[PDB]
Amino acid sequence: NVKKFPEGFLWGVATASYQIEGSPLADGAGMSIWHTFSHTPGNVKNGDTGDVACDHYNRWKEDIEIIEKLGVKAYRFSISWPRILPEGTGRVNQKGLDFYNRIIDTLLEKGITPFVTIYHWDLPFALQLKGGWANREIADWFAEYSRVLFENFGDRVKNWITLNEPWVVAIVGHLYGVHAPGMRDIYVAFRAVHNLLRAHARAVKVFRETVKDGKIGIVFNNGYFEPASEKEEDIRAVRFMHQFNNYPLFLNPIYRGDYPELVLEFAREYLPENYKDDMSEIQEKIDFVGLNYYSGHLVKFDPPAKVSFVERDLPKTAMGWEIVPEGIYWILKKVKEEYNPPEVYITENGAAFDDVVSEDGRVHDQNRIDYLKAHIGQAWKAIQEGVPLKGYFVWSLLDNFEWAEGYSKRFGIVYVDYSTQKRIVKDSGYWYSNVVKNNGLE
Ligand SMILES: *[C@H]1O[C@H](CO)[C@@H](O)[C@H](O)[C@H]1F
C-alpha cells in the first residue's frame, strides 16, 4: 500500500530547449539543425516547427511558478548550444547566457534543483556544415561549449548531464534520418556513436577542472525487450537489442573500455579503424547514469540487424507504445547488475495520451495517472532491492514539440493550449504534486 521513498529523493519534471522555448533566432542566437530540419518540407508532421512551441522563451517565470506551486523539487532542462555560441565555437552570446541565468536564479530562489542537460539535440547549424557528430573535431567543439557553461553557471548549477540519449542522436539522426540532421548512412551513424562518447568524455574532463563540487552524468534511452518465443535465436535477438538500443552501447565503453559484444559482431565494419585508441579517454569517471524508459517490445530473430518487432495486444499510448511497467524495474536492476553505477536517476518517464479539456475546465487524464503510478511503484521496488535510485523526472512538465511528431503528441502533466498559450494543470499533475508532498505513493 504505502510506498515511501528515501529521504533525499529528487522528484522532478523535465523539458528540452527546442521543444518548449520558441523564438529560436531571438537575441542573436544562431540557427540549430532542428530549426533547419523542421523548416524542410516533409520532415515533421503537419509542417510543425519550434518557431513558437510553448513560448517558454517569454513565459519561463510562469512555468517555473507552476513547478513551485506543484512543489516539484527538481527541474531538468536543456541549454540551446546556438543561443550561447551562435557559430558553435568562438563568439559567446551574452543574451543567451542571461536567458539561462534568469531561469537558474529563479529556480534556486524557489528551492528547485536545476539539472542541466548540455546537449539535447539542437546542434548549431554552423557545426553541421562542418559535419557535426560525424567530425572527430566535435570532441573539441563540445569541450569548449561545456567549458563556457561550467564557467558561467557552475557556481550555482551542481547537477549536469552531457548528452541526452546519444543512441537517438546517432542512429535516429544519421541512420534512420527521422531526426535532424536527417541522414541515412550507417558508417556516419557509428562514427557519431563514437564521437558522442569522445565528446562526452572530453566534457567530463573539463568539468573536473572547473566545477570541483559538482556532479555530472549522461542519459540513455531504454526499452524492455522480451523474446517472441523460447527459441535460442529469439533470446539472442533480445540480447542484441538491449546491447544496441539500451545503455550498454555507451556504458560498456565508459565502464569496460569497449563496445558490447553483439554490437561489435554487427557493427565493427562501420566503426572507425582504430576506434580502440580512444577507449582509455572514454573511460573518464562519471557520477551518475540517467535512464529513460517508456515501453516494452516483443522481438524475434528475423532473417537488417536480423531483428523484428512483433505487435502484442496490451494497452498502448497515443505513440503506439506498449505499456509494460515492469520494464522500469527490470532496467533499473539490470544497470546495477551490469555496471553498478554509484547513482542512477530515472531522467524520463511518462506518456502521451489524446488529452482534451472537458467542459468543467479540467483534463481528466486518468490514463496518465495510472501510467505514472504503476511505474513509480516499479521504481520503488528497485529501491527496496538496493538500486541506488536518487531521483525521478516526469517527461514532461508541458505538452510540447514532439520532434518529427510535432505538436500532435502531448506528454505534459500540464496542458498547453497553443492558440492562447494557456497552461492547464492536468489531473496527473495534481496527482504527482501529491506524490511529491507525501514523498511517495498512497
Ligand atoms: C525523451 O523522450 C521524450 C518523449 O519521446 C522526448 O520528447 C524527449 O526529447 C526525449 F529526451
Active site annotation includes 348: yes
> CA-CA distance, 96 to 78, in Å (whole number)?
13
Q: Which triple of cell numbers denotes residue 124?
A: 548549431
Q: Which triple of cell numbers denotes residue 264?
A: 561489435
Pocket test for ligand 1, best of 77, 395, 401 (most atoms within 8 A of CB): 395
Measure Cα distances from 337 to 216, 217, 324, 329, 341 in Å. 21, 19, 21, 12, 9
Residues 6+ apart with CB under 8 A from 152: 97, 101
Residues 6+ apart with CB under 8 A from 260: 243, 244, 248, 249, 252
Q: Look at the alpha carbons of 187, 294, 339, 391 in this order and tell me if their dihedral is positive or negative.
A: positive
Q: Which triple of cell numbers denotes residue 392?
A: 525521478
Q: What is the CA radius of gyration of the chain?
A: 21
Q: Look at the alpha carbons of 297, 353, 12, 23 in this order and tell me if their dihedral is positive or negative.
A: positive
φ/ψ of 54, rounded to 5, equals -90, 5
Report whether 412 contacts 13 (CB < 8 A): no
The Å distance, Cα 168 to ligand 1 centre, comes to: 10
Angle between helical axes of 326-339 and 366-384 (0-180°, round to 10)? 30
Pocket test for ligand 1, best of 122, 393, 402 (most atoms within 8 A of CB): 402
Residues 6+ apart with CB under 8 A from 228: 234, 298, 299, 300, 310
Angle between helical axes of 366-384 and 427-438 (0-180°, round to 10)? 30
List the one residue out of 271, 279, 302 whose CA is nearest residue 134.
271
Report whether 400 contacts 411 (CB < 8 A): yes
Q: Which triple of cell numbers denotes residue 129?
A: 556544415
Report whether 180 contacts 174 (CB < 8 A): no
Domains of the chain, by residue range, sit at 1-442
Do the strands 296-301 and 307-310 form a parallel or antiparallel pair, or are they unpaired? antiparallel
Residue 311 burial (10 A CB sphere; 0-12, 13-18, 19+): exposed
List the one residue out of 106, 9, 12 whose CA is nearest residue 350.
12
> CA-CA distance, 262 to 266, in Å (whole number)?
6
Strand, coil or helix: 68: helix
The Å distance, Cα 407 to ligand 1 centre, comes to: 13
Q: Which of 21, 284, 348, 402 is catalytic?
A: 348
How many other C-beta atoms are found inside a 10 Å radius of the C-beta of residue 47?
A: 12
Which residue has the least CA distance to atom 6 on ligand 1?
A: 402
Q: Which helix (H) or strand (E) holds 162?
A: strand 159-164
Report whether 83 contacts 21 (CB < 8 A): no
List the one residue out of 90, 99, 102, 179 whose CA is nearest residue 133.
179
Quick one: how far is CA 66 from the chain centroid?
A: 21
Q: Which atom of ligand 1 is nearest to the CA of 292?
A: 1
Q: Which atom of ligand 1 is nearest to the CA of 121?
A: 9
> CA-CA distance, 252 to 208, in Å (whole number)?
22
Q: Which atom of ligand 1 is nearest to the CA of 165?
A: 11
> For the residues of 380-425, what is the DSSP string, one character each?
HHHHHTT--EEEEEEE-SB----GGGGGG----SEEEETTTTEEEE
> CA-CA distance, 338 to 359, in Å (whole number)?
50
Q: Which of 21, 165, 322, 402 is catalytic?
A: 165
Residue 265 burial (10 A CB sphere; 0-12, 13-18, 19+): exposed
Quick one: how far is CA 91 from the chain centroid?
A: 27
Which residues contact ligand 1 via a Cβ below 6 A? 16, 19, 164-165, 292, 348, 395, 402, 411
Report whether 115 contacts 76 (CB < 8 A): yes
Q: Which atom of ligand 1 is nearest to the CA of 16?
A: 9
Which residue has the least CA distance to atom 1 on ligand 1?
A: 348
> For the residues of 184-238, what is the DSSP string, one character each?
--HHHHHHHHHHHHHHHHHHHHHHHHH-TT-EEEEEE---EEEESSSSHHHHHHH
φ/ψ of 90, rounded to 5, equals 85, -115
Which residue has the least CA distance to atom 11 on ligand 1?
A: 164
Report whether 180 contacts 34 (CB < 8 A): yes
- Listed by the residue before each break, gaps in the chain with C–N over 2.5 Å are 303
Omega before 181 within 30 of 0, i.e. cis: yes
Q: Which atom of ligand 1 is nearest to the CA of 164?
A: 11
The Å distance, Cα 302 to ligand 1 centre, comes to: 28
How many other C-beta atoms are found inside a 10 Å radius of the C-beta of residue 129?
A: 11
Measure Cα distances from 265 to 171, 172, 260, 270 in Å. 17, 21, 9, 11
Q: Which triple of cell numbers denotes residue 281?
A: 579517454
Q: Which triple of cell numbers denotes residue 290?
A: 540517467
How many other C-beta atoms are found inside a 10 Å radius of the C-beta of residue 96?
A: 24
> CA-CA distance, 11 to 392, in Å (whole number)?
5
> For the residues of 28-53, what is the DSSP string, one character each?
GPPPBHHHHHHTSTTSSGGG--TTTT
Quick one: how far is CA 88 from the chain centroid?
A: 21
Report whether 281 contacts 201 (CB < 8 A): yes
Domain 1-442: CATH superfamily, name plus number = Glycosidases (3.20.20.80)
Residues in the chain, how many? 442
Do the strands 344-348 and 10-14 form a parallel or antiparallel pair, or are they unpaired? unpaired
The Å distance, Cα 282 to ligand 1 centre, comes to: 25
List the one residue out of 153, 182, 86, 184 whose CA is nearest residue 126.
86
Quick one: how far is CA 271 from the chain centroid?
A: 24
